[PDB]
Design an enzyme around this catalytic site. Structure first.
Site, PDB file in Angstrom:
ATOM      1  N   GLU A  28       0.798  -1.213   0.000  1.00 38.73           N
ATOM      2  CA  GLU A  28       0.000   0.000   0.000  1.00 38.73           C
ATOM      3  C   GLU A  28       0.843   1.280   0.000  1.00 38.73           C
ATOM      4  O   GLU A  28       0.289   2.364   0.173  1.00 38.73           O
ATOM      5  CB  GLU A  28      -0.965   0.030   1.177  1.00 38.73           C
ATOM      6  N   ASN A  32       0.749   2.984  -5.216  1.00 31.36           N
ATOM      7  CA  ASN A  32       0.807   4.313  -5.812  1.00 31.36           C
ATOM      8  C   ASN A  32       1.973   4.491  -6.794  1.00 31.36           C
ATOM      9  O   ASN A  32       1.864   5.242  -7.767  1.00 31.36           O
ATOM     10  CB  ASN A  32       0.885   5.362  -4.710  1.00 31.36           C
ATOM     11  N   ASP A  59      10.190   5.966  -6.348  1.00 27.75           N
ATOM     12  CA  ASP A  59       9.785   5.936  -7.770  1.00 27.75           C
ATOM     13  C   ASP A  59      10.425   7.071  -8.523  1.00 27.75           C
ATOM     14  O   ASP A  59      11.072   7.913  -7.940  1.00 27.75           O
ATOM     15  CB  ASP A  59       8.262   5.960  -7.939  1.00 27.75           C
ATOM     16  N   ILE A  75      -2.552  13.917   1.499  1.00 31.38           N
ATOM     17  CA  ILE A  75      -2.471  12.488   1.084  1.00 31.38           C
ATOM     18  C   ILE A  75      -2.041  11.571   2.218  1.00 31.38           C
ATOM     19  O   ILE A  75      -2.712  10.571   2.507  1.00 31.38           O
ATOM     20  CB  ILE A  75      -1.464  12.282  -0.067  1.00 31.38           C
ATOM     21  N   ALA A  81      -7.984  10.954   1.053  1.00 31.05           N
ATOM     22  CA  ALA A  81      -7.271  11.892   0.181  1.00 31.05           C
ATOM     23  C   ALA A  81      -6.906  11.319  -1.163  1.00 31.05           C
ATOM     24  O   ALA A  81      -6.994  12.006  -2.182  1.00 31.05           O
ATOM     25  CB  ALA A  81      -6.029  12.422   0.870  1.00 31.05           C
ATOM     26  N   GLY A  83      -8.183   9.417  -3.362  1.00 34.63           N
ATOM     27  CA  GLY A  83      -9.141   9.403  -4.470  1.00 34.63           C
ATOM     28  C   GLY A  83      -9.111  10.601  -5.411  1.00 34.63           C
ATOM     29  O   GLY A  83      -9.786  10.611  -6.459  1.00 34.63           O
ATOM     30  N   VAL A  94      -7.684   1.878   0.066  1.00 38.71           N
ATOM     31  CA  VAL A  94      -6.608   2.093   1.046  1.00 38.71           C
ATOM     32  C   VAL A  94      -5.418   2.832   0.406  1.00 38.71           C
ATOM     33  O   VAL A  94      -4.758   2.315  -0.535  1.00 38.71           O
ATOM     34  CB  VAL A  94      -6.159   0.775   1.701  1.00 38.71           C
TER      35      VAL A  94
HETATM   36  O1  LIG Z   1       3.700   7.188  -3.487  1.00 42.99           O
HETATM   37  C1  LIG Z   1       4.475   7.169  -4.427  1.00 42.99           C
HETATM   38  N1  LIG Z   1       4.331   7.916  -5.511  1.00 42.99           N
HETATM   39  C2  LIG Z   1       3.309   8.753  -5.822  1.00 42.99           C
HETATM   40  N2  LIG Z   1       2.110   8.643  -5.203  1.00 42.99           N
HETATM   41  C3  LIG Z   1       1.055   9.448  -5.484  1.00 42.99           C
HETATM   42  N3  LIG Z   1      -0.087   9.241  -4.805  1.00 42.99           N
HETATM   43  C4  LIG Z   1      -1.302   9.514  -5.272  1.00 42.99           C
HETATM   44  C5  LIG Z   1      -2.143   9.109  -4.251  1.00 42.99           C
HETATM   45  N4  LIG Z   1      -1.385   8.608  -3.238  1.00 42.99           N
HETATM   46  C6  LIG Z   1      -0.082   8.688  -3.586  1.00 42.99           C
HETATM   47  C7  LIG Z   1       1.251  10.475  -6.534  1.00 42.99           C
HETATM   48  N5  LIG Z   1       0.479  11.449  -7.085  1.00 42.99           N
HETATM   49  C8  LIG Z   1       1.098  12.208  -8.045  1.00 42.99           C
HETATM   50  C9  LIG Z   1       0.595  13.356  -8.834  1.00 42.99           C
HETATM   51  C10 LIG Z   1      -0.770  13.636  -8.826  1.00 42.99           C
HETATM   52  C11 LIG Z   1      -1.222  14.726  -9.551  1.00 42.99           C
HETATM   53  C12 LIG Z   1      -0.317  15.520 -10.228  1.00 42.99           C
HETATM   54  N6  LIG Z   1       0.993  15.242 -10.201  1.00 42.99           N
HETATM   55  C13 LIG Z   1       1.471  14.190  -9.520  1.00 42.99           C
HETATM   56  S1  LIG Z   1       2.746  11.739  -8.317  1.00 42.99           S
HETATM   57  C14 LIG Z   1       2.577  10.530  -7.164  1.00 42.99           C
HETATM   58  N7  LIG Z   1       3.530   9.691  -6.780  1.00 42.99           N
HETATM   59  C15 LIG Z   1       5.705   6.273  -4.494  1.00 42.99           C
HETATM   60  C16 LIG Z   1       6.547   6.234  -3.222  1.00 42.99           C
HETATM   61  C17 LIG Z   1       5.620   5.074  -3.557  1.00 42.99           C
HETATM   62 MG   LIG Z   2      -4.426   0.704  -2.536  1.00 36.72          MG
END
Ligand SMILES: O=C(Nc1nc(-n2ccnc2)c2nc(-c3cccnc3)sc2n1)C1CC1
Ligand SMILES: [Mg+2]
Length: 194
Positions: A28, A32, A59, A75, A81, A83, A94
């Site tokens: 989890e 993402n 990443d 987030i 958050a 969603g 989750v």
């Molecule tokens: O969480 C990570 N990356 C991640 N996660 C996002 N996220 C979205 C919801 N929960 C985590 C995410 N959202 C991004 C995003 C969303 C909208 C505009 N620009 C970038 S980049 C990104 N990058 C990697 C470490 C595991």
């Molecule tokens: Mg999930």
């Protein structure tokens, strides 16, 4: 709230006694990253097991938004958050906030738009606002989380094989996503890339 999940952890992450939940925590965070990869931005994901039984996931996508309390923090600290940002990784509904609420420490480092950002949480709680800590040309997101020993009881150490097998499966389900596992406790490494 994050307290809802500390109160009833198993219900969110899996069984917190038998090692299921503790390993589910990794997927989890990775969930993402695989999604960032799937949206075309992330090319590689490095999952790492640290000598202190934390797990980091790095990443190379866009980097969680830093703008504003900051997006990133939202987030991390709000259950719903996630969603606001049909394939794979984790359990539907989750986000990383469950991981944060169940971690005694979580360190977040975002590389976005010429700048490094760092922030630390204890038990879900941010220690300071997300802040700039240098310049960089790379982009990406990094989560390092130390599982709470108040939540996870018997099996408390990450088992390389459980991780390896599921990361390989994930990379197979998502052709082209490059997943690397590293274990710093022993040097062991794998690359998963179909
Ligand atoms: O969480 C990570 N990356 C991640 N996660 C996002 N996220 C979205 C919801 N929960 C985590 C995410 N959202 C991004 C995003 C969303 C909208 C505009 N620009 C970038 S980049 C990104 N990058 C990697 C470490 C595991
Ligand atoms: Mg999930």
């Amino acid at each position: 709230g994050l307290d809802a999940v500390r109160k009833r952890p198993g219900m969110y992450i899996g069984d917190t006694d038998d090692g299921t939940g503790l390993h589910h925590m990794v997927f989890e965070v990775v969930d993402n990253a695989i999604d960032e990869a799937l949206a075309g931005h992330c090319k590689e994901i490095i999952v790492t097991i640290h000598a202190d039984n934390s797990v980091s996931v790095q990443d190379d996508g866009r980097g969680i938004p830093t703008g504003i309390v900051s997006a990133a923090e939202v987030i991390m600290t709000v259950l719903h958050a996630g969603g606001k940002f049909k394939v794979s990784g984790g359990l539907h509904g989750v986000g990383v906030s469950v991981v944060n609420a169940l971690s005694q420490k979580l360190e977040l480092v975002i590389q976005r738009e010429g700048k490094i950002h760092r922030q630390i949480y204890e038990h879900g709680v941010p220690q300071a606002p997300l802040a700039v800590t240098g310049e960089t040309e790379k982009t990406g997101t990094m989560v390092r989380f130390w599982p709470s020993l108040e939540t996870f009881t018997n099996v408390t150490e990450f088992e390389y094989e459980i991780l390896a097998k599921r990361l390989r499966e994930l990379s197979f389900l998502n052709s082209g996503v490059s997943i690397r596992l590293r274990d710093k406790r022993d040097g062991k490494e794998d690359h998963f890339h179909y």
